């Protein structure tokens, strides 16, 4: 998707 | 003590991604607003912020009473989450997000 990937 | 999402003018409810892009057009980095997620599911919201002159889409997850940008979810409200990131850079989640939530777009 266009969403940012956010580190868990 | 008022953590109500409705009480925050950076929360725009049911507006589209296009409406967000209208509001972020030509804005400074650190500009931001929150809208309902496009899916309308599990009480999620979508943060959009301005970085590099571009609009970065960030899911606000909501699960078991908590909120956050990634697991583990450690915030009790959307307002607490957004308030937290007024004064902390988002860089720990992604080094491309070395920016704060500075300038709300207000309803």
Domain count, chain B: 1
Q: Is the backbone peptide bond immediately before B72 cis, with ω within 30 degrees of 0?
A: yes
Enclosing domain of residue B35: 1-107
Q: What is the rounded CA–CA span in Å between residue B39 and residue B18? A: 15
Q: What is the rounded CA–CA span in Å between residue B46 and residue B40? A: 10
Q: What is the rounded CA–CA span in Å between residue B19 and residue B51? A: 18
Q: What is the CATH number of the domain that holds B18?
A: 3.30.505.10
| DSSP-assigned states of every residue in B55-107 | EEEEEEEEETTEEESSSSP-BSSHHHHHHHTTSS-GGGT-GGG-----EE---
Classify the C-alpha dihedral B37-B18-A1-B101 as positive or negative: negative
Contact call for B94 and A8, based on CB within 8 A: no
Query: Hey, which residues 1-8 in chain A have their CB within 8 Å of chain B?
Result: 1-8
Q: Which of B54, B70, B74, B99 best tests the A interface by mutation, with the highest count of A CBs <10 A? A: B70
Method of determination?
A: X-ray
């Amino acid at each position: 998707s266009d969403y940012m990937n956010m580190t868990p | 003590s008022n953590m109500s999402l409705q009480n925050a003018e950076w929360y725009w409810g049911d507006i589209s991604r296009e409406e967000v892009n209208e509001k972020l057009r030509d804005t400074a980095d650190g500009t931001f607003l929150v809208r309902d997620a496009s899916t309308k599911m599990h009480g999620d919201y979508t943060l959009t912020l301005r970085k590099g002159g571009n609009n970065k889409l960030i899911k606000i997850f909501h699960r078991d009473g908590k909120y956050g940008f990634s697991d583990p979810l450690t915030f009790s409200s959307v307002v607490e989450l957004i308030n937290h990131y007024r004064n902390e850079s988002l860089a720990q989640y992604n080094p491309k997000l070395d920016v704060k939530l500075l300038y709300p777009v207000s309803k």
